[PDB]
Write a protein that binds this DNA or RNA. Sequence first.
DNA 1: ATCGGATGTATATATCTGACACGTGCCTGGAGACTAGGGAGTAATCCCCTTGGCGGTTAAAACGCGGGGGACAGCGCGTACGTGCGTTTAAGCGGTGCTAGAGCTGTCTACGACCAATTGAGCGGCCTCGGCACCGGGATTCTCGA
DNA 2: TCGAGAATCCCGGTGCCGAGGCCGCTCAATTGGTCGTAGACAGCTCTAGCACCGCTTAAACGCACGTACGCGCTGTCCCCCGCGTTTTAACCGCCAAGGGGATTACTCCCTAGTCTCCAGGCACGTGTCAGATATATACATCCGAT
Lengths: 88, 90, 93, 93, 107, 107, 608, 98, 95
Amino acid sequence: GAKRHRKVLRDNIQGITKPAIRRLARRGGVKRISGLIYEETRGVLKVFLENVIRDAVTYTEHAKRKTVTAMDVVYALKRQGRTLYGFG
Amino acid sequence: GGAKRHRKVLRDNIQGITKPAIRRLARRGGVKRISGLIYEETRGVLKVFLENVIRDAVTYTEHAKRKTVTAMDVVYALKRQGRTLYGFGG
Amino acid sequence: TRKESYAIYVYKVLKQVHPDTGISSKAMSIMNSFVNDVFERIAGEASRLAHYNKRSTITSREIQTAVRLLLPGELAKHAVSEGTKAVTKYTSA
Amino acid sequence: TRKESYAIYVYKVLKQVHPDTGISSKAMSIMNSFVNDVFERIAGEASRLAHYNKRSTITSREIQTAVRLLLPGELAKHAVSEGTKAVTKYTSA
Amino acid sequence: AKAKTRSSRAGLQFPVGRVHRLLRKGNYAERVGAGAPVYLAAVLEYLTAEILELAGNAARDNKKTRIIPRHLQLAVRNDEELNKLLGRVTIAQGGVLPNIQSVLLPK
Amino acid sequence: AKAKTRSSRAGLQFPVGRVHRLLRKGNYAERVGAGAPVYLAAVLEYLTAEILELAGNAARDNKKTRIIPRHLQLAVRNDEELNKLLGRVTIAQGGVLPNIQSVLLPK
Amino acid sequence: DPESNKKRYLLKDANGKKFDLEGTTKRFEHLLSLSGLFKHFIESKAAKDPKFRQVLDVLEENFQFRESPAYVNGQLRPYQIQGVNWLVSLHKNKIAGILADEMGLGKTLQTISFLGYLRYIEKIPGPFLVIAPKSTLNNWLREINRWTPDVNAFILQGDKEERAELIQKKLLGCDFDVVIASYEIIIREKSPLKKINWEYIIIDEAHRIKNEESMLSQVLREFTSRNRLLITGTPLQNNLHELWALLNFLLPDIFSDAQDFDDWFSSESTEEDQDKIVKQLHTVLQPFLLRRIKSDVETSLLPKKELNLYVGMSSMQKKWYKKILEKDLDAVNGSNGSKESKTRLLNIMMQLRKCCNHPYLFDGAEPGPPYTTDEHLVYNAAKLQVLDKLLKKLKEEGSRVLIFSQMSRLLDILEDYCYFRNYEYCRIDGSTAHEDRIQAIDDYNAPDSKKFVFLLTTRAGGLGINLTSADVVVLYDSDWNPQADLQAMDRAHRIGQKKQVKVFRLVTDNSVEEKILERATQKLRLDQLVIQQNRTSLKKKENKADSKDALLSMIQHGAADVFKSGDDIDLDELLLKSENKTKSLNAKYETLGLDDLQKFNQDSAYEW
Amino acid sequence: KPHRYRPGTVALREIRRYQKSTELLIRKLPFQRLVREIAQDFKTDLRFQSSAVMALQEASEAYLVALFEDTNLCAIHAKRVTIMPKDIQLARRIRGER
Amino acid sequence: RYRPGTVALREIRRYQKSTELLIRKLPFQRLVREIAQDFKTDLRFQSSAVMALQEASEAYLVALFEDTNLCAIHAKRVTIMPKDIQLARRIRGER
DNA sequence: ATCGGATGTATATATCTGACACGTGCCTGGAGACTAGGGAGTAATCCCCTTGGCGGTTAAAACGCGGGGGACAGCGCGTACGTGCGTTTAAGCGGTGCTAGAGCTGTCTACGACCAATTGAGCGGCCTCGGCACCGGGATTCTCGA
DNA sequence: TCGAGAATCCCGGTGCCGAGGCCGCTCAATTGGTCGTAGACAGCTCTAGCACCGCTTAAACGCACGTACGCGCTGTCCCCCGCGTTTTAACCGCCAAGGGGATTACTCCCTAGTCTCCAGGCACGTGTCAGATATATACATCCGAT
Ligand SMILES: Nc1ncnc2c1ncn2[C@@H]1O[C@H](COP(=O)(O)OP(=O)(O)O)[C@@H](O)[C@H]1O
Ligand SMILES: [Mg+2]
């Protein structure tokens, strides 16, 4: 009863749990994994996401919308040379 | 001992990219020690790159009815390859 | 509302090639994106080809040259053959 | 023949920023090519922006969105500021 | 007189009126020749048929009678030639080709 | 009335009429607004001024009063922003930014 | 008998639809005898269906429980005996029903009594299935083990392995009496229950069926059976589509269509058509919607002690209130031409509620870390000080308290301060998993135990729970739906309570919190008037006339005061003042709120 | 003496089972929360579709899978079979994403 | 004498400071012409076309050698080997 | 370690030579006035689809462990590459001889854009059953201590 | 060291739901006209190209010593893997509310388009200074012997 209420919460980047990086690595064909590699993964994912989401939000702004439609994301990806098939 | 009229000379053109020229390029890239087999690999890589660019440039130039490849054709071909080049017009 | 797409024609071609296969919706959407992507690539390259040569018209020659530029090797060869064959058949008829 | 280019305007900007500095010929050609490349990138992206939203008009709003899409960070911020300033001054005239 | 689609005349299957319209209302050029829609329709025709017959081959090799995105992925990746065309393209729900570096295999 | 250029009326140095003409006869859209040439000219002018100021700094760093392509290269590659905007661009006669790895330096 | 049970239970014969004329025709003629005003459906479907056309082709010319049953342990309430008689009578007529007593009326005991009739009188120990929500499974099983002691009733719990174990051992072995299974366990175990000829299917809290196309409804459609006993405590919503869905599940023979039912009853050229056919609705629903009300059956209890505290708002409470208002003055100082987003309005309201509840819900409010638990935070909050004195009054005199919060961190603070006060507590917030929830509740409601106070949240508290050993149900605050609060305070007010139920309600004076109750009472009071006579002097049809303006007026209660501007409680004077002001507002609203219920009367007060 | 597979065996079994499937490897709700939090720094009060977030996840996972596939080559090139942060840094530096 | 490696770093300093072309002129123009001989015969080249080709070629090779050097260093070496060229081009998507 | 030595490099100076920054005419395209029309701005509806919250089942994630195999450091050894000198060869420069290729200027006509009217290919909605996605039991295979 | 245990491929029956089929509203295809565009033409001037030849000069070629580094082997030790347990939060099924995405109508104003007019920018020609070059000196670094 001496444990005071703390209510600490994880960063959202920590929601990319270690096993998820392991699964992605396996599909990459990687056998043995270091232990310091999960922070590098969490750091490169965030950079990728920010660069994409910035452009998606810009495209949304221009149309005077408040909804980020899948076509905005497809446009944003295609802008960075990462064409995605399957959403329009 | 005749039969000299046949050319039998003029070693391959890719050998005109000599060993020290590749050394110069390597040093500009910042490389201290060079293996002995890098030379042939470099020649192969350069030949592939030239073939791709020149194919596209010749396509551009024969579209326009000409039979002479001008700098603009090469610039367009490079841009199409993804390697913009500044300086030669465009 | 009116939302045109190539699903009907993709199905026509598929039944032409593999007469008794099918195709799920997601694959059809992917094929649609594929067709639109290739169409934009070819049309944009032909537009640039016309602009480079001071022309103001997109003709058969520009589409053929953009096909040569975009498609690689063996695909380019066969697709050019297809295009010329179709255009001559149309013109003669 | 007349082949127009952004030479004199670049030189005017130069003599505005570094009043006592020159510029060689090849450097000027590179700068002219740079201006053309940036103009083409912005104009193409604005053209696609108009086409995505089903508009037949290119306005200053499309140009501003395109420059925010192309330029990185500080460049984009300062260029947007400059363009807003110039268009405001032009309208109020 | 009774109409005849330009698709029928050309002998193609893709639409030619639609391609003509998209070429005219896409700011690709001020004027569009009469044969360009036919040629472009033929090229799109050919490419679609190529990729689809590869995908159907893969679907049979997987013992199914219906293409799914995975089969398109296998057709494009396994085929050395279309793979260059769709080099920068990511196909949703495609997965990857099976591939393990030999160095990792046990002795 | 005496004519006044749109550039001066906007306060810029780049030509607003020429930018307007290119936007129109460049196949970008059907109709071209009135502020678009002004905005575009202002942005191009800003970018040119930025790069030219950096190049002039570099040229003065070598006791020279002209900007040669080497100085354009140095300015572009030593600034993290213009190095992103022109990452895929090759500047003729630019050379290389000086850099040798620390592991290679002698003990 | 596993042999006879095996012979009877299993679907020996596989078939689709079986009846042709007997059951359908008998149901139809019996319903015709009991005020047969329902032809429209009959001839409509006969015309549009050849099968019921030839069914109608014959339609042209063609133990009463005087006491509580001996076998079930104990006795039954008179209305309970009436209900079991009702179900028996419906059984005799081969038509189902919908038991819909008000909540807490022990309807589960009525269902078990019905099943006791079924097994012990007419002797059909058939396979009975009783769907329920998971929280209510244990209570069911306990009731089976309590009233009819000898029944092979087993829950269907556990992971796939033990589920499969029980299935293949008892269920497919047909070695049971009744099965119990949640909604999800019903959905997952389709096939094992499908291959059983279900004597009955029983559902507790049938709201979950209210959507006809819900996956649970879809699944339940093809459970072969003969008679159903849906149960729904809450009043049926005046919407008709869900009533059609319920009746459709009950009697698919009759209510076999939606569009025809709608076009007959609701969709009419004039609205007076459906206003008058309200009487026919009542007539049709009378035979098979048996419902009793706790008010007009049972007085078996001391009514209520609805007391009310108008607590003050403390100095640091004022500091953080002013902080919030300075942060959010613009949207409530009138508005920007009513352009403020409704989400912004609700968020400002929420922040105000958090400040009023306790000014530690905001970070940086507690003194410098690290923290120590003391009275510092009981006097950072006037609410907490009043509660502290009230607890140190009630506990010593002998009572047990049931505080209902609205959010978890407030219960966290109450937990911490109670551990400072060294009283044994239990928290049953939604996080607490089962067999831990059960652990805590059966620890509290055990015989003499050290757990004195017992803390809950409303949304996760009032759901099939029987915390009756306590009396005082002080609420930290209240919500928009008064029914949730009512269920919370009736967690202790129910059958079996032997002492008066005392109700306390904290209200922060000169705040947005004070306006809640009158806004609640306006919502509260108008509801009852509809129940009895369906109309009153309800000239305030505006229903606050807005929400962007209703909550705007809601915020501005303490607008001009705090914005422009030991301390012991002495609880007795607050009791007196707040109870007088409470009866005052009761009298004010009693006259229909004629003076000013809402009247959309507000103006900007956050000027500067 | 219970049964333990020697190191590297289960890690090849898993490679085989994940290179012969198509589903998404990351959870969905954690990725959606990450997406919304990142987007909060550009416009406040943004609504998202569902196919928007699915497209983001598809692109994201493809990116990471290719990145790990290059990291593996870098690690093997150093005569190791373990991938370490230096390998990702080298891979990204070479790809031009630095 | 100079101990091995002394002349190499000095040589690198020389070349990371100048700008001129490092490959000779005729040996490259001959290569260009005979490598285009096969796509189309009877071809002509403007001089600036060949200069543009050489500029692009050397830029490509210099970048490739920087990536190769990084690869070789990453393997605990200072000598570059064809292993490294192959790895760099494979990473950059060209192979 | 330190010190002299020998080499390579940075610094200051006079010389040139060729590209840059200037001025001049002029002509074309940018500006000023004006008209007509359609795109898009603004308002008002509508209902789709996002949000926001809840409770359950169960799979995945987290944790701690035991142990051996992979990373890393150290040693040795042989080889292959670097440094430097001598030798040879090819690039670069200049100069010859002629000719087509490619870029500037007018007249035709046939082909692509526009407008009207009209039908019929294609889009949308709605069904229905065959491929596919479960789920279980069986033989096959493959890994790992004895 | 082959037999034990765990993982895999295969067949058989089930259920379910998504793709393919069918039926009913709308723009590509038919005519008629007609105007720029872009093929054809001549003319005119600068580059490329294909066989040579002569000359200077630096760079490429080749070679011998040696050295330091690549590479293999050994040890060691600790970090990462497989695994079993416990906890947690994701997914799913669900319900309720309301923002806002998408559509329709009107109108008006801003853009296109034509005519007139004029001045800014472009080609041409030109004079001098910025920077490259070649010397001589100072001095900065590396290297070996002590
Ligand atoms: N005749 C009775 N004798 C004793 N207890 C009863 C009787 N009738 C009802 N109860 C009690 O009343 C409580 C009501 O529980 P339940 O029926 O689950 O509530 P609800 O009717 O709202 O679902 C039960 O705990 C039951 O023990
Ligand atoms: Mg109940």
